[PDB]
Design a binder for this molecule. Structure first.
Ligand SMILES: [Mn+2]
Length: 189
């Protein structure tokens, strides 16, 4: 890792085998004795949407769905399906800048969700520092997928012109997986 890497506790990340079923990485099927939530980062234009199903009883990701270019309505429909598959799991939705259609459709489709708008660097810092702490404590468990692990590895610290800390992907990379995971783990106790 670089000097400015955010996830200094990557060595304590638990790596889980999975089956790739289309856009889903399935670690395990629904356990009805457990309670789940889903961290949801939507894709605005050609950005990736990522939905991370977290078993709140074990702290392990059960399923992660990722794609780009899906229509807004299809993103909501895929989220509905995931929620229903995991016992009407509640969605932690980053509602910031998603547009009226997704917001309206979450309600119109009766999706079980709570808003967590990632509306500033301060909110992002809260989410990320919680994920990083849980990770160092050996409480984060994710599909053992190189794309996921690489996005975590390449998440780094930078300073703005005003001196404020920001966190983002190295180079010209993506962080939708990082954010989806952080949205899920925001609920984990
Ligand atoms: Mn994103």
């Amino acid at each position: 890792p670089a000097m400015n890497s955010v996830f200094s506790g990557l060595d304590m990340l638990i790596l889980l085998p999975y089956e790739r079923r289309g856009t889903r990485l399935v670690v395990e099927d629904y356990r009805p004795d457990h309670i789940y939530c889903i961290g949801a980062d939507f894709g605005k234009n050609q950005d990736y949407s990522v939905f991370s199903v977290l078993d709140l009883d074990t702290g392990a990701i059960a399923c992660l769905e990722r794609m780009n270019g899906a229509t807004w309505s299809d993103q909501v429909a895929r989220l509905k399906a995931l929620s229903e598959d995991y016992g009407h799991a509640y969605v932690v939705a980053d509602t910031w800048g998603v547009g009226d259609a997704i917001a309206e459709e979450l309600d119109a489709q009766g999706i079980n969700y709570t808003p967590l708008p990632v509306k500033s660097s301060s909110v992002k810092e809260q989410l990320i520092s919680n994920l990083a702490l849980l990770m160092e404590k050996g409480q984060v468990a994710v599909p053992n997928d190189k794309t996921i692990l690489d996005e975590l590895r390449n998440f780094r610290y930078y300073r703005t012109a005003s001196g404020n800390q920001v966190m983002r992907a190295y180079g010209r990379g993506h962080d939708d997986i990082v954010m989806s995971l952080a949205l899920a783990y925001s609920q984990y106790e």
